[PDB]
Design a protein around this ligand. Structure first.
Ligand SMILES: O=C1Cc2cc(Nc3cc(Cl)ncc3Cl)ccc2N1
Ligand SMILES: O=C1Cc2cc(Nc3cc(Cl)ncc3Cl)ccc2N1
Ligand SMILES: [Cl-]
Ligand SMILES: [Cl-]
Lengths: 4, 122, 122, 4
C-alpha cells in the first residue's frame, strides 16, 4: 500500500 | 486521502485471465475466419476501440457472436487477445505485420505504436 | 520472449470503472440494506473470494440480484466497491471498523491486512 | 514497454  | 494497493490492477487482470482460461462468465464468441475465441465483452471493450464501439451499440451489445473482417488473421487476433488479458505481447519477426494490422483494425493504439517502432528499427 | 506494457492493467481497470460509472454492461445488482449497487460480475469475482464463490455456483451464476447479510453496512460496501474498480481505498478513522468487517465478509484479504495494521497503529 |  502507498500514498498515491 | 485514499491509500492505494500497487498490485491490485495486475491481480484483477490475472483473475480475469483465469476466468477466461476456464471459460467462466464469457459472454461472446469472436469469429476470425474458421477460428472461434471466447471472451468477456467488458475486457474486449476496455482494450479495444473497435469492441468499445460494437458493444456500446444498442443492437450489437446483445449479440453473442461477432464476426471479424475476413482479412483478419486468427494468429494475430489470438496474440492480441492474450495481450488484452495479460499485458504481454508475443511480438516476433514472423508475426509483427499480422499483429500491427490486427491492432490497427481493433484500435489498440499502444500496440500499433510499439509495432511501428519495432518495424522502423529493422 | 514477450514484451510488456506496464500501464495496461491500470488502463483496463480505469476503463472498467468508466463502464461502471455509465452503467454499461453491468449484469448484477448488489443489495445492502435499502441500498443498491450495480456492478460487473467478473470484476466482483476478480476482487472478492465471496463473489468468486457465488458466481461460480451453477444456480447463483444466473441471478441478476444478490442480497448481502443484513449486518453489512452500505457505506463499507460502497468504499470496497470503489476500491475494486480503482485500487484506491478511502480508509478513515470513522469507517475503518465497517470497512474491515465488510472486507472480511467479502474475503478481500489485502484490505483486511491493511485495516488490521492501521487499527494496531492506533 | 519493458522486458518482463
Ligand atoms: O487504443 C485504444 C484502447 C481503447 C479502449 C476503449 N474503451 C473505453 C474507453 C472509454 Cl473512454 N471508456 C470506457 C471504455 Cl471500455 C476505447 C478506445 C480505445 N482505444
Ligand atoms: O482476497 C481474495 C481476492 C480473491 C479473488 C478471487 N477470484 C479468483 C481467484 C481465482 Cl484463483 N481465479 C479466478 C478468480 Cl476471479 C478468489 C478469492 C479471493 N480472495
Ligand atoms: Cl493497446
Ligand atoms: Cl483485497
Amino acid at each position: 500500500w502507498v500514498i498515491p | 486521502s485514499c491509500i492505494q494497493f500497487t498490485r491490485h490492477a495486475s491481480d484483477v487482470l490475472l483473475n480475469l485471465n483465469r476466468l477466461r482460461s476456464r471459460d467462466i462468465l464469457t459472454d461472446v464468441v469472436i469469429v476470425v475466419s474458421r477460428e472461434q475465441f471466447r471472451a468477456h465483452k467488458t475486457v474486449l471493450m476496455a482494450c479495444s476501440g473497435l469492441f468499445y464501439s460494437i458493444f456500446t451499440d444498442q443492437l450489437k451489445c446483445n449479440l453473442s457472436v461477432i464476426n471479424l473482417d475476413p482479412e483478419i488473421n486468427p494468429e494475430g487476433f489470438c496474440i492480441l487477445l492474450d495481450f488484452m488479458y495479460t499485458s504481454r505481447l508475443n511480438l516476433r519477426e514472423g508475426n509483427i505485420m499480422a499483429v500491427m494490422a490486427t491492432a490497427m483494425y481493433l484500435q489498440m493504439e499502444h500496440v500499433v505504436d510499439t509495432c511501428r517502432k519495432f518495424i522502423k528499427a529493422s
